[PDB]
Each structure stands twice: as C-alpha cells, then as structure tokens.
A paper describes a structure:
The main protease of SARS-CoV-2 (Mpro, also referred to as 3-chymotrypsin-like protease or 3CLpro) is responsible for the majority of nsp processing, cleaving at 11 conserved sites along the polyprotein including self-excision of Mpro by autolytic cleavage of its own N-terminal and C-terminal autoprocessing sites. SARS-CoV-2 Mpro is a functional homodimer of two symmetrically disposed protomers that are each 306 residues in length (33.8 kDa). The active site of Mpro features a Cys145-His41 catalytic dyad, which orchestrates nucleophilic attack at the carbonyl carbon of the invariant P1 glutamine and the formation of an acyl enzyme intermediate central to efficient peptide cleavage. Using C-terminally substituted Mpro chimeras, we have determined X-ray crystallographic structures of Mpro in complex with 10 of its 11 viral cleavage sites, bound at full occupancy intermolecularly in trans, within the active site of either the native enzyme and/or a catalytic mutant (C145A).
C6 (form 2), C10, C14, and C13WT have also crystallized in space group P21 but with a distinct unit cell, two molecules in the ASU, and a unique conformation of the donor substrate (we term here form 2 - see also below). Interestingly, the others diverge from this canonical binding, we term here form 2: in C6 (form 2), C10, and C14 (crystallized isomorphously in space group P21 with two molecules in the ASU) the substrate sequence is kinked ~ 90° at the P3 residues and tracks instead between the dynamic Met49 and Gln189 regions. This altered substrate trajectory appears to be coincident with the close contact of the donor C-terminal domain in this crystal packing. P4 residues in all substrates except C5, which interacts with Gln189 Oε1 form a hydrogen bond between main chain NH and Thr190 O. In the non-classical (form 2) poses we observe here, the P3 side chains (Thr (C7, C13), Met (C10) or Arg (C14)) instead extend toward the S4 pocket due to rotation of the P3 main chain, perhaps another reason for the restricted sequence diversity at P3. In the form 2 peptides, P5 and P6 are redirected between Met49 and Gln189, possibly due to the dramatic shift of the Gln189 side chain, reminiscent of motions observed in the C5 structure to accommodate the unique P2 phenylalanine. We note this critical hydrogen bond is also conserved in all of our kinked (form 2) substrate structures as well as canonical poses, highlighting its importance in substrate binding.
Residue numbers in the entry:
A (entry chain A), B (entry chain B): 1 to 306
The structure:
Amino acid sequence: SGFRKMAFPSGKVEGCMVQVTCGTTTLNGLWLDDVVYCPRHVICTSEDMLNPNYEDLLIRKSNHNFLVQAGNVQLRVIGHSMQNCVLKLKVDTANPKTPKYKFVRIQPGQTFSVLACYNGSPSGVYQCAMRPNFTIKGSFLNGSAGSVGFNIDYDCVSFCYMHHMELPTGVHAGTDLEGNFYGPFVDRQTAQAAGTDTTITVNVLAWLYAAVINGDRWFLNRFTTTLNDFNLVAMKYNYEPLTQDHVDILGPLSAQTGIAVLDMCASLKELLQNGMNGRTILGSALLEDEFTPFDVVRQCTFTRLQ
Amino acid sequence: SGFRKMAFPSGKVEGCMVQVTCGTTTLNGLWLDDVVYCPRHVICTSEDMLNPNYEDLLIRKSNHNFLVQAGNVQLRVIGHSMQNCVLKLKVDTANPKTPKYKFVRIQPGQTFSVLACYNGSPSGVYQCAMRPNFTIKGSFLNGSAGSVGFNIDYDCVSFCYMHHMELPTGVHAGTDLEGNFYGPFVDRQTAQAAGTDTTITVNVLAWLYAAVINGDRWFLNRFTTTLNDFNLVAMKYNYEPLTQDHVDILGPLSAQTGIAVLDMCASLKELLQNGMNGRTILGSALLEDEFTPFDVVRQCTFTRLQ
C-alpha cells in the first residue's frame, strides 16, 4: 500500500530529448523521426528590439543558424518552419529511438508527467495537473523550455505539453505539441497574469478514495447528500461544480471501496465546512486536487475481479 | 523557479528491470551485466511451514526452477546463490543495456529515486528519503518487491536500495544491493515494528531555504538562536538534533540566500512552537523533511559563480 505522486517511466521520452541552440540562446527540443520540435523563442536573442515579432526574426535565420545536438552528435537542420509557437526543425537523421506516439491536447483537471530537461539532457521527472486556469505548478529554470509533458497509454507516448515560460506568480505555461498555448498566454514580452484558479473537485474525491484504500478513513461518516446540495456547498469553497460525468468517473473507486460517490461528497462537504481538524490525509494537511481518478486506480488496482 | 519532489529520469534503470518467477511467486529482478539480483523470498511458498530455510531451498531448487524474463525473452539461469536477503541469479546473457553503476549503502536522511515495478515492467517513479528509523514511505503493492531505488551522479547509477516488504504501519523496508536490510528488520513473517520516526531536521531547513529562494519568506525573522539552544526546542519536538556537520552542508543555501543557518534555525524554532497558523510554505501546510540540501540545489540557479 501507500500512495504517492508518481510519474510515468521517462525512458521512452529521454531518447527524444535534444539541445537546440540558435545564437547564444539554448533550449530543449523533441526529436521524433526526422523532425525536432522546440519553442520558437529559441530564435530570440539579447540584442533583439523590444517586443519582437517572430515572423520578422525567423526571416533572418537560416538552417545553419540552428545547432541541434543529441548528446555528442550534431544533427543537421535541412529545413525549418514555424507552426504557432513551436519550430519544426527538419533534420537529416531519423531518431532510431522514436517511440509510438501521438500529439494530444489534455483537458483541465488532467495530469501528465513532466521530463524537465536542460541543454538537451533530462534532469528529473514529476507529475503536474493542468490547472483550470491553464497553468501548471512545475519546477523550471532558464534553459528548461522545450521540456515536454506526456502520458503513457499501453505502448504509446501521448505528448500533451511543451513548456515555454514562467508567469510572475511563479506558475508555468506552455503549449500542446502543435504550438497552441494552454490558457490566454503568449510567448511574448508582454504583461500576463494567470486568471483565478479553482479546486478540481473530482480529483479531491479520488484522493479521498485513495485515502480509504490505504486505511486513512477517519473522515468517513455514515452520512450522504445530494449532487445539488453538495454543489451548493462546493461553489462556496471555490470548488468546481461536480457533474454526473464526474460521478461516473469515480465509479471504479466507489465500486472498489464500497463507498458511494454521494457518501464521499458528504465527507468532503464536511471537511470543507469544518476543516481537517489538525489531521493529515495521506501525509497532507491540505486537500489534494492533482490526482485524477485514473491516477489512483493506476496505483491501487481493482481487486473486485479476482 | 518553483520547487517539486523530483525523481531522476528512470531510463537507465528501466532497461535493467526483469521478471523473476519461482513456482507461483513472481517479483522483479535487477539485471546488471550477467547477474540478476532479486529478493530471496521469491522462492517462498505459503505451503512452507512459514519459518523458512532459505539455504536448503537453494539446494532444493535448480537453475530450471527460476524463470527469468527480460520482456518476453527468457534468460537461462546458469547459477544461483544467496547473499544475505538477496538472490544473485547467474544467467547466460550479459545485459546489453547495463549502465555504469555502483552499489551504495544510503545514510538515513539521504534521498533516492524509486522505480516502481511489477512483473519486470516499470510502473512509475517517485522520490523517497531513507527515514532515521530505516524505513521509507513509498507506494508498493504485492509483486513490487525487487524494485530498486537509485541516484544518478553524472552518468553513473548508484543503486542504494531493493524493496522487499511492508510493515504493519504502511511503511516499507528493504536492503541495499548486497542483501543487507536497512534497519533491524528481517524478511520473515514475524512481528516487527519500526522504531520512533523523527523529523530530518537538516532537510526541513533545506526546504525552508528552497521556499526563501522561491519567494516564501513570511516565516523569516530578525531573531536568532544557537545550536544547543535550538536543539533544545527541537529534541523535545521529535526532531533529529542538528549538528555542525548539518550546518556546513547547508552552506551553499545560506551562501545563495545570505541567510545564516542559525537565523533559519531561529525561525524554524518559531515555526515548531507557534505552528503555521493556517499558512502554507511552498504549497505545504506542514514542514517537509524529505528534501535534502543537495536536492534543493539541483532545483535552483546560483547567482554567485557567474
């Protein structure tokens, strides 16, 4: 037993990570087959004019301006194109380690594994959830842009995030693998702020279900409530509304634990009104909302079926 | 910026994982060159009286009895022997994916990355700290035994832990790669309890530094204290006593923060008594003690040396 934030194994992703340098600017690229994808602001430099326009600056760059290295080997750029906020760098060598993959746009509330990288070299791995305000609470320094996030589904690496920038609040923003930002953000030197965030109600219920599976059940009561009355409570604590779709996604954890979803909502309603009473749940003094129902099941299993 | 529990990329380790099956028991193995390392209780059968004779089961078993799988490929065991609580299965093929590696005995307070496995097949990765009572707080199900914990140092993998079992309190126990258990535990079906766990004082300090580097400062104070003076307020509070060895270790964090360790100790003493008064530090409502100083440094940029 035991429950912990757990990243997907990063081996498949590590073999696609490369360093991209244009001028004195370096960041990370993702090498699949004969293409390297990377944030377009690799072409930005110090001596650029204020609030540059990427159209104009890329026009100055030739193939020979982009220096891509996969370890101690130079990949030769043979073509470049810009697709929204990412650069597609056609190279003359196919990555022999390209996994089965898909490009995916995750929804808010969902999690993914982040392979933070520097200078083309993977550095560490951890879980993030896409916040309802379309930011993630990551750990990224300068040189980490191009790091990707991803999930594994059977044999297929689903890439869902490429990191670009940090916001003044200290939270992070990036694109899908087509260069489309999550949230109202731009890879520009313009003032931006994350909007107000909300708590991912469905995730907190999954976490409480995980808590029960692991024997942490002090917060259960005989009580139950309705979907309407729970949501009237949730709204007042900045929790996002709970939909029947959410209730159904919690099915397997309710089947597994024997605790009906609306039973769980009553315990949660109670922790929201009266607090955690100095108690910790799974070693946390706060309510965790970055564990999806899938992430719990992934870690406990369904033992009804023998 | 930002601060997160971060596992090492697990790629170099995933290529070492294999599946070991003796009779009806299946757990994971570690395939380094031409040796597979695994827990000895893979040979245990519940049909045993219980108190096992591991040595004579080695005589009882032949090489045929051990089924080693790298994916769907079988490795013929050509030798088998016991070293403390670990099996060393000699196979006919040397692991072509063997990395540069050491075998190390971690010290209580140090951290490592656990690659959680079932059936030779990686499931996920997360950080653990070896607790002062020689347990770890992981997420391990039945069949997770044989999973390893490791640290990457350049391109050399330091294997420091192999998981064997779970204690009735929900924490986990294991050996180094030489089969020697961390702590007074044995791999038998007998009543065992972990001693009293204590907070790793040096690590809470390192964490408080990570917050200051990252922006969380409210806890700081112009107040000061001394070493024995701080260790008074702490020993009664179940904390590891702080030593001059720990002070020095935090040197670089103080150097970057310009905050003296004793000054940090003072505001930490203040944090023990008062409590956090509904306030968080780096997204946490309790003091985190599983970030070592070096773990912090790896997630910070250091203005000093330019």
